[PDB]
Design a protein around this ligand. Structure first.
Ligand SMILES: [Zn+2]
Lengths: 317, 542, 182, 388
């Protein structure tokens, strides 16, 4: 029988708040009488500084001449093209031929002097990859703030599955019986784990015999949480890569070589193929199976052949 | 067998993409890129299960560095150059300045989540924080009161000449630095607090008595505020805390309805089927005939379920009188025949190998009955300890004097003291099916009776009603009633096994349709063992 | 106006983007080779490779222009927001040391690759002559194939987690909190 | 058998509140100490109050500017104090409150005073509930932890003992201590926590250290709702193997109610008996141990389990009856010294625990002013009136 009416007191009301007691009852007589909020130079958030007559806002570090909040300049602050629009070279000394005067003054750098010109008449910004660099790699894409994201990163979860996902579900299946994770909607069969050939759905009368399983983000291969050493599921961050795929970077010690894969090339003339030799190719991997950044048409027979050839070379050692 | 090792691996892999990826791994090993350690690690998930293939591969290849885990990557030496003056040589040689961890690298720029809590747990944390702020202010105030009381005691034996000049540094002659700063800043205004604490710092014994009196009356009012908040706080927490401790039982009212259905149990037994088949195909050709076995160590449990059943018989209104009579008689006769019980020995007062081949409805009926038996089994197996613990519930005498015990369920007789817990929960289930128990009180009594362990009995009336509805299909459906009648014909309590169940098998298989599911429920007389072996579509193929 | 880049340098630029934005790895200015000696070696090798019909004058013009141009674009379209702090530290150091920091003395060729990649956007943003554009794009192609022929000694894949020199260093937690935070 | 136990309490350590709606709460330590005093445990125990730490004494692990920031921080001037905060990640996840410097000072002082009492030999078991912060890095504050006092305690122990072992049994494991002792061979860190999108996100089975600290970092990830029996099965054999192989000279145990059944951001289902029997098992070895308290986002259960921890360290069995104290109303309706375990699912399968145990054994088979430093002096503080 909670009573928040009379038993809630007057001096101290509902907590995480205050009341008029600290202001009205505080007499002491002992002394006896235009701007933007997006930072359009790196497309991120943080501490912002803005100009009076310019709607663009910048970061403290995203300025050609870096500055810190502890020693910020006093008075009005102006951006680079602000210094070249409301100030010199656009209000007095009107731009008639000073662009050619740049060439005539700085010792015939005309093949670069116009770029030397618009360097100063350009707002500083963080590096952004050009659109023609983006299109030749279809597996990569630009994120929300402008970060790298290939197919290795998982799509961020919407808030419906994240906050308002009921109480029985929770963030992970680590609680309650969830038999829907053991059955795929594609065919209605049972997800058989790769290591142990068991679905391990268990029973409702004995929930403890149920073993958690997860599908793969690349090949949709089921995998138990107890076979591969792993505590819980993988919901945010990079996509859950099952321990059966080619690693992006491997390490062999002879200092060392990384071999950070060869990315992925979109389907056009740069993606060029040539099958001519199967034996002793020394093509350092990066292959595809069939029934520059060249990728030879490698088959099963050649792979098993050169594997046998190499382990016959290496066993004499 | 080096020729057929690759074909054997291809047969074991199954999926084309996984075979191609294993091919890529083997080629990466073959091009002087992948070492023996990484290959064996990959094979540990690839061909770890096949012990014969793994041993052959290890013998044929010829097997007899740092871990560098995903987190704690190496920092450059430039960041190491930092003063850290309080450092000596051994403390240099133990601590590393070039390894740092930061959680966004673990989250991969995606953040982290908290464990989802029920609304009762959320309001428990809420009432905890309201209880925190109150007494935290109160006892910071008692510390300030004792500090100014020591100050006043030092004043009381001292004269006016050095009363005028009593200059002190911050701290008021104590080991603390800013707690009084917090207290007199919270009590007074933001701008006024700094000036009044300045006056207290440089001129004591003139502002100190009046601030002592003000803080003392602040203390007294905060104390009685806590006192009358305490009662409502406790009465709210008495019903909030036990429900907060229930996590699976809170959603049990819906999860039990969701998961005690026909299709869920069908998937549940077919999973055990397919695991047995492919595991033995990996291991050994003959297949076992036992899966999902139940044990029946107690005989009175069936009588308790009968009490629940005929309590539900006289309560419902959606069925007719002879329908209710026939359903109750059939429900009693099912154990009177199948479990070889000659007659129910509780049918007086104080009551309110052999093979079975059956369709899907009887399978669901028996599965619900085994589930209710298991619920009562984990009720009874801890009964001798829970009843003891309730019997010696040592109430605190202090709490007896000033009335903080939870007497919410004690007024209406829902308490469990002075009575066996199992008979009490049986009676509670009787009145629970009877529909005059106000369910939330029933799960609350179960929470404060068995220490939240009796979460499977929350929907005892629901599973009883589902049991009754499934048993209603044993007579109305012609195929199920015909199967029951030829079980009357089949059951004879005589040595007729191994030559009479086969004709039974083909007779039921011709009796039912192609889409109906087939079940072999084997019951054993000694030790009361049962076994249900799945034979779905294993007889109509040939 | 279109410019092509060989796929090796595009993959290097994509790896740089991953290292900075995703892997949180800044480049190492205290390295063996910087942009000034990149262009010095380019000029010397091309001059000693071919004959002397008068191309060395425009070669040296291109080299000096690219050096000064790198000096200006370092804080304009290069330097991801992570690396702005790392610029700030060494600029403050040069302010304390009373010496002037031109980027060609510490910065590697990856930022030169970034500038070459963003070159068509700046070319299209100017009213600048056609034959000059053609000769500039031809010098860009020549520099690009020269970087292709010296790609092993210049862009070698190394992990700073176990090696002293990897042309990249890992970002600390404090650095991340300042750079990507406030 | 019988062992003298050092308790390090201050009346000021519970007077700091991180803010409204905050999980971390130092106020639980005050009513915990009230529970020890009200239980009559002072007759077979000696208790001292540790002095607050200074700036340079706090510099033994953290950098100079971080300690200066922690000393000069104040919520009033937090508006322009924005560069450093982000550098040390303070005010975003760990808000700035009054008395943060003093709270860090008393926490560190208690930790190094317990370490010095272990080293000098006046006591066998050191208990410091005033400070158990373990998420603090060299120049980073996380998990509402600012000073990594456990590293300072381990350092003071290493000034006398050759080998020091740190044991973490609660969720949100201490990544700062493991980071500080990742490459050294004389310090071994073992932790028990949950992995899988948890707030630390650090500590793997492959995380066993690098360089000379290889195979010297043990991480045992768990799942939701681990009960007392499987926690015993995952604790006792691996702890026995750690004592048999590593042979530590001192044990730093992080005690707290974060791994209890009820918690705010916790995930485990440990009862009070399960949380206390592990400490009883590690105390049965007889080697000196150090006890810190820096976990537990609930309070009502945390005071009770800390009281039971102290009672078991005093080699007595406390009764279930709870005497009257000035915090008597916080406890549950039963008002017994009983942290009731919840009924949530035990998804921690035995097979996963066995695989983790086997690979952990596979990793562990290769093991086989500073003027005031040294500490070892404190105020007596014997006049405590907290009994009710
Ligand atoms: Zn934690």
């Amino acid at each position: 029988k909670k009573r928040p009416k009379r038993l809630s007191s007057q001096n101290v009301n509902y907590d995480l708040k205050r009341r008029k007691i600290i202001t009205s009852e505080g007499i002491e007589r002992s002394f006896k009488n235009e701007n933007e909020d997006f930072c359009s130079a790196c497309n991120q958030s943080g501490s912002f500084l803005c100009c009076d007559t310019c709607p663009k806002s910048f970061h403290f570090l995203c300025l050609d001449p870096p500055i810190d909040p502890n020693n910020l300049p006093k008075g009005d602050w102006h951006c680079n093209e602000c210094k070249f629009k409301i100030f010199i070279n656009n209000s007095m000394a009107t731009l008639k031929k000073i662009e050619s005067n740049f060439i005539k003054q700085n010792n015939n750098v005309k093949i670069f002097a116009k770029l030397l010109f618009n360097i100063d008449s350009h707002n500083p910004k963080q590096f952004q990859l050009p659109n023609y660099i983006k299109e030749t790699f279809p597996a990569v894409k630009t994120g929300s703030r402008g970060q790298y994201s290939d197919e290795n990163d998982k799509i961020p979860l919407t808030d419906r599955q994240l906050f308002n996902t009921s109480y029985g579900q929770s963030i992970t299946k680590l609680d309650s019986y969830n038999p829907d994770t053991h059955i795929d909607s594609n065919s209605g069969k049972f997800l058989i784990c790769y290591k142990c050939n068991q679905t391990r759905l268990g029973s409702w009368s004995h929930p403890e015999n149920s073993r958690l399983i997860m599908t793969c983000d690349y090949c949709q291969t089921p995998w138990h949480l107890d076979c591969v050493p792993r505590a819980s599921f993988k919901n945010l961050g990079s996509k859950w890569k099952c321990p059966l795929h080619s690693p992006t970077k491997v390490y062999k010690k002879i200092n060392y070589k990384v071999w950070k894969k060869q990315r992925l090339i979109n389907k056009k003339n740069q993606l060029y193929y040539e099958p001519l030799q199967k034996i002793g190719y020394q093509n350092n991997g990066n292959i595809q199976i069939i029934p520059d950044f060249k990728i030879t048409q490698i088959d099963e027979n050649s792979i098993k052949y050169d594997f046998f050839d190499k382990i016959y070379k290496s066993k004499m050692v | 067998e080096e020729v057929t090792f690759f074909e054997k691996a291809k047969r074991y892999i199954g999926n084309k993409h996984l075979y191609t990826e294993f091919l890529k791994i083997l080629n990466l090993y073959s091009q002087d890129i992948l070492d023996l350690d990484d290959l064996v690690e990959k094979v540990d998930f690839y061909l770890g299960s096949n012990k014969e293939l793994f041993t052959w591969f290890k013998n044929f290849v010829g097997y007899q560095c740092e871990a560098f885990g995903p987190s704690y990557k190496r920092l450059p030496k430039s960041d190491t150059f930092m003063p850290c003056s309080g450092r000596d040589d051994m403390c240099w040689e133990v601590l590393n300045d070039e390894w740092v961890g930061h959680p966004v690298w673990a989250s991969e720029d995606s953040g982290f989540i908290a464990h989802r809590k029920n609304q009762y747990e959320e309001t428990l944390f809420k009432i905890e924080e309201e209880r925190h702020e109150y007494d935290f202010y109160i006892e910071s105030n008692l510390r300030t009161i004792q500090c100014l009381e020591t100050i006043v005691n030092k004043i009381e034996n001292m004269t006016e000449n050095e009363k005028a000049n009593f200059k002190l540094p911050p701290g008021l002659g104590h080991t603390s630095m800013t707690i009084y700063k917090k207290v007199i800043r919270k009590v007074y205004d933001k701008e006024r607090g700094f000036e009044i604490i300045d006056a207290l710092h440089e001129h004591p014994a003139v502002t100190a008595p009046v601030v002592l009196k003000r803080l003392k009356q602040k203390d007294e009012e905060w104390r009685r505020a806590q006192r009358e908040w305490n009662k409502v706080w406790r009465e709210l927490e008495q019903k909030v805390f036990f429900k907060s401790l229930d996590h699976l039982g809170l959603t049990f009212k819906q999860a039990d309805k969701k998961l005690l259905t026909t299709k869920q149990l069908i998937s549940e037994i077919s999973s055990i089927k397919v695991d047995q088949t492919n595991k033995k195909i990996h291991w050994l050709t003959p297949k076992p005939k036992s899966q999902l076995d139940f044990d029946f160590p107690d005989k009175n449990i069936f009588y308790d379920i009968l009490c629940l059943a005929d309590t539900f018989i006289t309560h419902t209104t959606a069925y007719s009188n002879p329908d209710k009579e026939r359903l109750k008689d059939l429900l009693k006769y099912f154990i009177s025949l199948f479990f070889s019980i000659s007659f129910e020995k509780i049918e007086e007062s104080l009551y309110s190998i052999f093979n079975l081949f059956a369709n899907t409805n009887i399978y669901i009926f028996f599965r619900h009955w085994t589930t209710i038996y298991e619920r009562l089994l984990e009720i009874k197996q801890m009964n001798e300890r829970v009843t003891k613990e309730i019997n010696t519930r040592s109430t605190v005498t202090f709490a007896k004097d000033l009335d903080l015990l939870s007497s919410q369920l004690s007024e209406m007789g829902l308490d469990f003291v002075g009575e066996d817990a199992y008979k009490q929960v049986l009676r509670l289930s009787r009145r629970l099916i009877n529909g005059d128990l106000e369910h939330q009180w029933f799960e609350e009594s179960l929470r404060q009776a068995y220490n939240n362990k009796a979460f499977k009995l929350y929907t005892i009336d629901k599973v009883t009603q589902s049991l009754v509805k499934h048993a209603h299909t044993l007579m109305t459906d012609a195929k199920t009633a015909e199967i029951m009648a030829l079980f009357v014909k089949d059951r004879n309590a005589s040595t007729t096994s191994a030559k009479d169940q086969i004709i039974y098998r083909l007779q039921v298989r011709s009796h039912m349709s192609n889409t109906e599911n087939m079940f072999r429920i084997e019951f054993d007389k000694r030790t009361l063992h049962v076994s249900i072996q799945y034979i779905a579509l294993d007889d109509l193929t040939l | 106006i279109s410019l092509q880049i060989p796929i090796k340098l595009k993959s290097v630029l994509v790896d740089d983007w991953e290292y900075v934005t995703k892997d949180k790895k800044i480049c190492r200015l205290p390295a063996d080779v910087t942009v000034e000696m990149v262009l010095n070696k380019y000029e010397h090798e091309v001059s000693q490779e071919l004959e002397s019909p008068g191309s060395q004058s425009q070669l040296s013009e291109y080299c000096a222009g690219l050096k000064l141009y790198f000096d200006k674009c370092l804080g304009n379209m290069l330097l991801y927001r992570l690396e702005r702090l790392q610029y700030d530290e060494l600029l403050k150091k040069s302010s304390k040391d009373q010496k002037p920091l031109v980027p060609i003395r510490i910065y590697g060729a990856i930022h030169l690759l970034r500038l070459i990649s963003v070159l068509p956007e700046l070319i299209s943003s100017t009213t600048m002559d056609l034959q000059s554009c053609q000769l500039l794009i031809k010098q860009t192609e020549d520099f690009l194939v020269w970087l292709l022929m010296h790609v092993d000694e210049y862009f070698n894949d190394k992990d700073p987690n176990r090696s002293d020199d990897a042309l990249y260093v890992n970002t600390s937690s404090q650095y991340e909190g300042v750079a990507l935070g406030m | 058998d019988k062992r003298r136990v050092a308790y390090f309490y201050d009346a000021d350590v519970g007077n700091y509140a991180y803010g409204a709606g905050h999980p971390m709460k130092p106020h639980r330590i005050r009513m915990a100490h009230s529970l020890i005093m009200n239980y009559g445990l002072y007759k077979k125990m000696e208790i001292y109050r540790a002095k607050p730490a200074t700036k340079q004494e706090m510099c033994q692990f953290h950098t100079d500017e971080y300690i200066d920031f922690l000393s000069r921080v104040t919520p009033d001037n937090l508006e322009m104090f924005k560069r450093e905060s982000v550098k040390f990640n303070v005010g975003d996840d760990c808000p700035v409150f009054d008395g943060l410097y003093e709270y860090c000072s008393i926490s560190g002082g208690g930790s190094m005073e317990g370490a010095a009492r272990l080293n000098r030999g006046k006591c066998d078991v050191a208990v410091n509930y005033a400070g158990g912060l373990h998420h603090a890095k060299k120049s980073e504050a996380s998990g509402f932890c600012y000073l990594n006092d456990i590293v300072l305690g381990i350092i003071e122990l290493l000034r006398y003992h050759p080998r020091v072992l740190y044991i973490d049994i609660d969720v949100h494991h201490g990544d700062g201590v493991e980071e500080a002792f990742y490459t050294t061979d004389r310090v071994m860190t073992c932790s028990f926590h949950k992995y899988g999108e948890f707030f630390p996100g650090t500590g793997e089975l492959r995380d066993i250290g690098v360089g000379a600290g290889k195979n010297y970092a043990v991480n045992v990830p768990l799942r939701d709702g681990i009960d007392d029996a499987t926690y015993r099965s995952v604790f006792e054999p691996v702890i026995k193997k750690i004592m048999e192989w590593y042979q530590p000279s001192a044990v730093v145990l992080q005690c707290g109610g974060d791994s209890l059944s009820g918690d705010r951001l916790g995930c485990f289902n440990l009862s009070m008996e399960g949380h206390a029997n592990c400490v009883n098992y590690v105390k049965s070895f007889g080697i000196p141990m150090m006890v810190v308290g820096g976990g537990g986002y609930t309070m009502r259960n945390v005071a009770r389990t800390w009281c039971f921890e102290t009672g078991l360290l005093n080699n007595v069995v406390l009764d279930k009856d709870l005497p009257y104290n000035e915090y008597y109303e916080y406890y549950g309706p039963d008002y017994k010294l009983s942290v009731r375990p919840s009924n949530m699912f035990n998804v921690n399968t035995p097979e996963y625990l066995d695989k983790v145990m086997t690979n952990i054994f596979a990793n562990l088979e290769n093991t086989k002013v500073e003027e005031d430093s040294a500490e070892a002096k404190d105020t007596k503080g014997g006049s405590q009136y907290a009994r009710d």
